Design a protein around this nucleic acid. Structure first.
Ligand code: MG
Ligand code: ZN
Ligand code: ZN
Ligand code: ZN
Ligand code: ZN
Lengths: 45, 69, 10, 56, 53, 48, 56, 1176
RNA sequence: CCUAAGAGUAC
DNA sequence: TTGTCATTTTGCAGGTACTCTTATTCAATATG
């Protein structure tokens, strides 16, 4: 599903809607959404 | 944050003269003025570009990465 | 006074 | 806007930047500098208001 | 970009990198080239791939 | 004035209730005050 | 005092001011975005049907 | 150097300052006050009172149960834990600040108290005195009474003992100084509240109309008691020409001003001679006796203590006491209400009588024109309540509420004979909610603005906010006593000018200590007790005051002061204690209370070896301090406390500063007596009796003013402007800004440390976290586009990164439990089954309703998708069906803002409901209208930007980054700007750093000589060529580097226009604010200007068509708007008037209609008529 | 949405 | 058949625009 990263473990997790937001590796309750896969364009100016 | 690529006023490339500047300051125990003159920064625009830079990126690198691979 | 600084008076 | 000269009718000149631009000589009645002063613009919405604004 | 710098920060720094332009007259402006966004007649493509191992 | 303001009209016997446009709604403060006035009026009427 | 003697009005803009030696005394420079926001209602007349149609 | 005892130089003092800031820090007062509150004040609050006794009498109808019980509850020691957080599942774990900030928690630690419950029983025998005994049911057992918020880096915080590496691990910036609370994830700082000191007698003259001429008052208060303010006033009735000059005292809870002699007789001093002895200490002072005779003449009617007590009771405002108990009532007034700060017990009547005599003595001295009336603005008479005392009084009130609740619960459960439980008794929500409410909101109760959101725009801004003092409300003036304690030029320009102050760099606030050891020292060393003091036998006796309490007299004040100074200089007395000896007034005052503001100073002793006064500090101590600093960056450590404990430096506050002589610098003022004409003129004061020496004059400045280069070469308002404006400078506020979800953040791309730098700015970490850039500035009338404070910025320089910035904005959104199963849900709303969906595109939202980082977002786009359940089965609006069970509560991006989404953070709140934060990043590039300023108050906006080829250029091809108008210089007299430009040019050429410290011996002539040695014109002028034509400019241009700040006021955040938009629901007028697409205010005096212009139709159009035009119907019979108008059916009818053919329509502002309807609702008829009934 | 408070810009 | 003079109570409002952020909405005992 959608990917998140533990704010402390820096590990990758996949979360569904019904999943409680925790890191299975350590138990941290703060997660950051993963970087988008669609390309990003920047003007070098 | 990190050394600017070019001098703001004249546009001389100074982003490749930061590590050389630090090496001259540390290894050779040269004062700042002589080290700046050695690298070829003769106009005081470039001299203030390199002399007054604060390398904050080291501090940023101290924290653990948010996304670690 | 005033107000401020009624009147005086009133 | 302490006096009537601090509220005057100007002619629009459309310019490509995000600031109101005015002549230097008209800053004295407005008591205006360019150190961050903001100014206000009102547009008449009828021919009568437009005409009396331009003629008075 | 998992670094400590913002993406447009690095983009600006890259835009300030001087590149060889001895034969720049043989390249065409992107505005007057028939390609869609960029092609070989009007651009040069570089790739920066770095890892902190 | 004989027609527009007689002295006995300074005593309130009927309160004109303003329409909801005056006190638009979370009720307005005026609505709560009018509710309090009605409650007091009903209490006094029942006591009498 | 807060709604009758003075009130908030439509068709008004506010922004920072800058000086321009190349503007006339009675001219004011208006940002293009402000000019695109503020509008004037012009009655359709035989004398100005063409330009109003073009603006539409 | 080589000599260990050689005198120090002016350069050596910076080592001392370095040691000071190595031990204290910048926010030492906050942490010290909080540590004092936690370590000692909480225990004192708990132990004082808080012993609930409930005596349930026997109420014995029959003698079989004539037993009276007594339940008592006492509170023992208090334990404060490390900060921890609860959870929805009940799991409790350690909480760190960079988790509470993200999760909107409160960085608080639980409080527990050892509660001991005892019960006593006695036999209720009438007549016999009850005797209560233990039943051996002694139950004790800590209980949770609430949570105390903990400021960061305090002794009870996780970061107090953290190292730099640990701080990096915990996502905490090592440069962060702490001293603030985290309330609901927001950083709150307690502004130091200024107040007048207590227990000090102040005498003030009164105006001519008033009958009282002089008033002597004391704001009596006791620290270790009820902490209540009782104001005693002693007033001298009658003007100068009046004859009946009677002195009267305003006792508390008394309706009238009792004559003073009545009070003396009530206290127990009957004879007139003894009263006058208690008042006047000089027999020869016949003027005071003559002025005081009316008082004894007035009081001759009462010649007995009981009579005076009866008189006071008769004047007592209670009026509910019988005649014989009035004596007792008066006794209670004179014991527990009259001068509480002296004592609350009985048997100390003589002390209070002596203090009253002293107050009357001060009043008569002021009335006799022997002393001036007390200055209310004297900073030594002021106290700054820090976090400690504020939290202490708030917690005292809150715990009193809790213990009253405990007593009420105990009474309820014993009267109903139910079982007693401790958990059901205590309500930790009381303390927790009270503290959280007081810290979360500005108000301090159940004052305003006591707690403020910590300013995080720039590092210097944060430092200035953490050292800020506010005075509740000429008090706005900069007083003389403010020297070295508050910044001379750092204050807001608005209504708070002078009221809001900032601490000096080296100024500290005392935390308060126990005065018992000092009283014991005084008694041991020969202080005469006040009880057996007879002024006649000891005429020239120095009165000794401790915390405003006259404790006695001493006959040899010189030796006493010398030994007290020795004890304080070896650390036996706490150095915060201030001791003042007034020789002329023959007084000795010792202050140990909290809130006193002091500063450190060098100590100057006789130094018989050199035969002249010299500093106690020598080159050996400087060498040891340097060695310790070098080791920190193996020998014995030598810190600031080492200097303090060996009598090298001293802490002096304003009161003690009154009685000392200070040398400005050691090298010029200590030694006894062809000069450089470029140097400024200084004097030697022609006097050698100094007691102290300034560590450095530049330490009188605050945090913001220490950034100014050469502040002594500027006009003072310019320094004030820069002090207020550097807080708005843009830079790097913290190093860990990448892991903080702040609401707004601004970061420079390339911060540069100044070329012109001060010695004091390397303790403020300004060279590590700069907030500006060194721009090549030319002062020239180049094109006319930099007139009236405008500037010309180099477009090519902007293209290369000059003053470019990052801007982060964070949006927070929670899901809330509207009911048991009415939980909100973060999701992507669908137009099929959602109401009130915004016009912004929802496409960028993925399944969970949160835009993944990296996606570009423009204005009005939805970034957080949230829906809430509603009641189904409703049909309306044309397209509302039973499927629309969800109402949209999404959060769109700001209308005027756009950028790249940087980061999104999902977590659980305190209640356990998921909530998110979305931080979006954009880049601000300087453009026309952005505000920039030098460090000398030279603000200005960018007029125009020229490319490099169009700018004027020197012979070396250097073009300026900025061009500023010459006309900004002469009127503003910012000479420091020019001097700093010259110094920066020299520093850039030579590679050194320009020492722009204020009071150094750095002159323009020397800088010019160095610049000429570098091959440039000595005064900084350069021959420049016009960019357009290449021809030489006839005038040479002042040219060189200068440090500029980019201010927070950008034009893109201020531009606003509105043709037509949302209207206010009540008045049907445009809404307020550019954030709401509001309208501009056409105020009263704009209308006055338009009236002066004579444009009536334009005014009508502004007030009616532009804002609110309403058509309303009235009738010609009654002018009221009570006309029922069915427009479609074309039927107009005013009920009551019973007319249908006499109706008019008028166009009036909707505000006017609302005003008329409100007048009608207020029983007023504003009848509107359309024809004249009277001739003009 | 309302209210309150605080900070700030130009006078 | 008229002046007299000498204490005690009487009401208050503070410039013009404009920007931003933060918190909070009565808690708790009591009856349906
Ligand atoms: Mg101005
Ligand atoms: Zn983890
Ligand atoms: Zn250069
Ligand atoms: Zn191409
Ligand atoms: Zn009618």
């Amino acid at each position: 599903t959608l990917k998140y990263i533990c704010a402390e473990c820096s590990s990758k997790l996949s979360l569904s809607r019904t999943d409680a937001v925790r890191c299975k590796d350590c138990g941290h309750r703060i997660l950051l959404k993963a970087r988008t896969k669609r390309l990003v364009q920047f003007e070098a100016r | 944050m990190i050394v600017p690529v070019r001098c703001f006023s004249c546009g001389k490339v100074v982003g490749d003269k930061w590590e050389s500047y630090l090496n001259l300051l540390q290894e050779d125990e040269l004062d700042e003025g002589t080290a700046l003159s050695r690298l070829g920064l003769k106009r005081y625009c470039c001299r203030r570009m390199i002399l007054t830079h604060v390398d904050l990126i080291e501090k940023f690198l101290r924290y653990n990465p948010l996304e670690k691979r | 006074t005033x107000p401020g600084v009624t009147x005086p008076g009133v | 806007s302490l006096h009537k000269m601090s509220m005057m009718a100007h002619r629009v000149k459309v310019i490509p930047y995000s600031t109101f631009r005015l002549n230097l000589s008209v800053t004295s009645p407005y008591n205006a500098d360019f150190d961050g002063d903001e100014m206000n613009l009102h547009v008449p919405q009828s021919e009568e208001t437009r005409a009396e604004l331009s003629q008075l | 970009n998992t670094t400590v710098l913002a993406d447009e920060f690095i983009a600006h720094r890259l835009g300030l990198i001087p590149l060889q332009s001895m034969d720049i007259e043989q390249l065409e402006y992107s505005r007057d080239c028939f390609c869609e966004d960029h092609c070989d007649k009007c651009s040069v493509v570089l790739t920066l791939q770095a890892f902190g191992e | 004035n004989e027609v527009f303001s007689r002295p006995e009209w300074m005593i309130l016997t009927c309160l004109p209730v303003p329409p909801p446009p005056v006190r638009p709604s979370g009720e307005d403060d005026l609505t709560f005050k009018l509710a309090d006035i009605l409650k007091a009026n009903i209490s006094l009427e029942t006591l009498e | 005092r807060g709604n009758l003697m003075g009130k908030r009005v439509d068709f008004s803009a506010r922004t920072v001011i800058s000086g321009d030696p190349n503007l006339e005394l009675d001219q004011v420079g208006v940002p293009k975005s402000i000019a695109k926001t503020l509008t004037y209602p012009e009655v359709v007349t035989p004398y100005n049907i063409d330009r109003l149609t073009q603006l539409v | 150097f080589e000599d260990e005892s050689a005198p120090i130089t002016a350069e050596d003092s910076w080592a001392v300052i370095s040691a000071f800031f190595r031990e204290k820090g910048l926010v030492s007062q906050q942490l010290d006050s909080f540590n004092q509150f936690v370590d000692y004040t909480l225990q004192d609050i708990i132990c004082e009172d808080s012993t609930l006794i409930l005596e349930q009498l026997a109420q014995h109808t029959t003698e079989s149960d004539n037993i009276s019980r007594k339940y008592e509850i006492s509170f023992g020691k208090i334990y404060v834990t490390k900060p921890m957080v609860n959870e929805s599942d009940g799991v409790t774990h350690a909480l760190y600040p960079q988790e509470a900030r993200l999760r909107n928690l409160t960085y608080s630690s639980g409080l527990f108290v050892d509660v001991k419950k005892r019960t006593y029983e006695a036999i209720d025998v009438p007549g016999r005195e009850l005797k209560y005994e233990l039943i051996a049911e002694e139950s004790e057992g800590k209980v949770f009474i609430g949570r105390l918020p903990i400021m960061l880096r305090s002794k009870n915080c996780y970061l107090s003992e953290a190292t730099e590496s640990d701080l990096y691990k915990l996502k905490e910036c090592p440069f962060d100084m702490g001293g603030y609370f985290i309330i609901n994830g927001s950083e709150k700082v307690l502004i130091a509240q200024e107040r007048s000191a207590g227990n000090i007698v102040q005498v003030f003259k009164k105006a001519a109309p008033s009958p009282i001429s002089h008033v002597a008052e004391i704001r009596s208060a006791l620290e270790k008691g009820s902490r209540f303010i009782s104001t005693l006033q002693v007033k001298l009735y009658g003007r100068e020409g009046s004859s009946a000059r009677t002195i009267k005292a305003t006792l508390p809870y008394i309706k009238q001003d009792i004559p003073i002699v009545i009070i003396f007789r009530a206290l127990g001093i009957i004879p007139d001679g003894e009263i006058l002895e208690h008042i006047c200490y000089d027999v020869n002072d016949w003027q005071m006796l003559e002025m005081l005779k009316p008082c004894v003449e007035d009081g001759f009617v009462i010649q007995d203590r009981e009579t005076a007590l009866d008189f006071i009771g008769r004047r007592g405002t209670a009026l509910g006491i019988k005649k014989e108990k009035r004596i007792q009532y008066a006794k209670d007034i004179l014991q527990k209400e009259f001068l509480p700060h002296i004592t609350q017990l009985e048997g100390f009547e003589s002390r209070k009588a002596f203090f009253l005599g002293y107050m009357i003595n001060r009043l008569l001295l002021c009335a006799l024109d022997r002393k001036d009336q007390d200055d209310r603005d004297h900073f030594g008479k002021k106290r700054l309540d820090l976090a400690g005392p504020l939290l202490a009084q708030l917690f005292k009130t809150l715990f009193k509420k809790l213990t009253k609740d405990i007593f009420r619960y105990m009474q309820r459960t014993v009267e109903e004979a139910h079982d007693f439980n401790m958990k059901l008794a205590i309500n930790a929500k009381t303390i927790t909610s009270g503290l959280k409410y007081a810290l979360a909101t500005g108000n301090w109760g159940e004052r305003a603005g006591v707690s403020q959101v910590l300013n995080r725009y720039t590092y210097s801004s944060t430092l200035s906010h953490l050292r800020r003092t506010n005075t509740p409300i000429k008090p706005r003036q900069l007083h003389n006593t403010h020297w070295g304690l508050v910044c001379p030029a750092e204050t807001p320009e608005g209504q708070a000018c002078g009221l809001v102050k900032n601490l000096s760099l080296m100024s500290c606030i005392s935390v308060g200590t126990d005065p018992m050891p000092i009283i014991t020292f005084l008694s041991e060393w020969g202080m005469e007790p006040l009880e057996d003091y007879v002024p006649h036998q000891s005429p020239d006796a120095t009165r000794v005051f401790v915390n405003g309490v006259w404790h006695g007299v001493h006959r040899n004040p010189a030796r006493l002061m010398e030994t007290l100074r020795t004890l304080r200089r070896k650390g036996d007395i706490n150095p915060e204690v201030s001791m003042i000896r007034d020789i002329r007034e023959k007084e000795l005052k010792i202050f140990t209370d909290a809130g006193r503001v002091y500063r450190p100073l060098f100590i100057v002793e006789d130094d018989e070896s050199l035969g002249h006064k010299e500093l106690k500090v020598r080159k050996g101590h400087i060498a040891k301090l340097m060695a310790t600093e070098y080791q920190d960056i193996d020998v014995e450590e030598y810190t600031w406390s080492s200097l303090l404990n060996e009598g090298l430096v001293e802490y002096i506050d304003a009161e003690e500063e009154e009685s000392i002589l200070i040398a400005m610098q050691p090298e010029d003022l200590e030694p006894a007596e062809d000069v450089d004409p470029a140097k400024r003129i200084r004097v030697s004061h022609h006097a050698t009796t100094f007691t102290h020496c300034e560590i450095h004059p530049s330490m009188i400045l605050g945090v913001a003013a220490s950034i100014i280069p050469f502040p002594d070469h500027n006009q003072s308002p310019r320094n004030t402007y820069q002090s207020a404006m550097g807080k708005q400078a843009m830079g790097v506020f913290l190093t860990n800004y990448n892991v903080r979800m702040d609401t707004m953040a601004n970061i420079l791309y390339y911060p540069q440390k100044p070329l012109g730098t001060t010695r004091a700015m390397e303790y403020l970490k300004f060279r590590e976290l700069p907030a500006g850039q060194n721009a090549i500035v030319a002062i020239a009338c180049y094109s006319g586009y930099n007139q009236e404070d405008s500037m010309i910025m180099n477009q090519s320089s902007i293209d290369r990164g000059l003053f470019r910035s990052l801007f982060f904005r964070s949006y927070m959104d929670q899901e809330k439990k509207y009911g048991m199963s009415i939980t909100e849900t973060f999701e992507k709303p669908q137009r099929t089954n959602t109401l009130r969906m915004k016009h912004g595109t929802y496409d960028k939202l993925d399944d969970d309703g949160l835009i993944a980082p990296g996606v570009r977002v423009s204005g009005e786009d939805v970034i957080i998708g949230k829906t809430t359940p509603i009641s189904p089965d409703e049909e309306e609006l044309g397209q509302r069906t039973a499927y629309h069970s969800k109402r949209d509560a999404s959060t769109p991006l700001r209308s005027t803002e756009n950028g790249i989404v940087d980061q999104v953070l999902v977590t659980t709140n305190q209640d356990g409901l998921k909530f998110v934060k979305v931080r979006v990043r954009t880049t601000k590039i300087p453009q026309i209208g952005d505000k920039f300023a030098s460090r000398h108050g030279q603000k200005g906006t960018i007029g125009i930007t020229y490319r490099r080829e169009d700018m004027p250029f020197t012979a070396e091809g250097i073009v300026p980054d900025l061009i500023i108008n010459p006309h900004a210089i002469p009127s503003r007299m910012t000479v420091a700007h020019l001097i700093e430009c010259l110094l920066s040019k020299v520093a850039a050429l030579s590679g050194n750093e320009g020492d722009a410290s204020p009071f150094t011996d750095i002159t323009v002539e020397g800088i010019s000589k160095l610049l000429r040695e570098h091959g440039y014109q000595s005064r900084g002028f350069e021959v420049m060529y016009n960019g357009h034509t290449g021809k030489k400019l006839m005038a040479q241009i002042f040219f060189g580097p200068t440090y500029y700040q980019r201010l927070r006021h950008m034009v893109d955040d201020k531009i606003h226009a509105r043709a037509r938009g949302p209207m206010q629901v009540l008045t049907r007028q445009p809404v307020e604010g550019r954030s709401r697409d509001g309208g501009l205010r056409f105020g009263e005096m704009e209308r006055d200007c338009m009236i002066a212009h004579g444009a009536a139709s334009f005014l009508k159009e502004r007030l009616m068509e532009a804002s609110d035009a309403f058509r309303v119907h009235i009738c010609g019979i009654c002018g009221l708007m009570t006309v029922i108008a069915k427009l479609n059916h074309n039927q107009f009818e005013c009920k009551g008037c019973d007319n249908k053919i006499d109706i008019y329509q008028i166009h009036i502002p909707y505000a006017a209609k609302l005003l008329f309807q409100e007048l009608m609702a207020m029983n007023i008829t504003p009848r509107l008529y359309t024809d004249r009934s009277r001739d003009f």
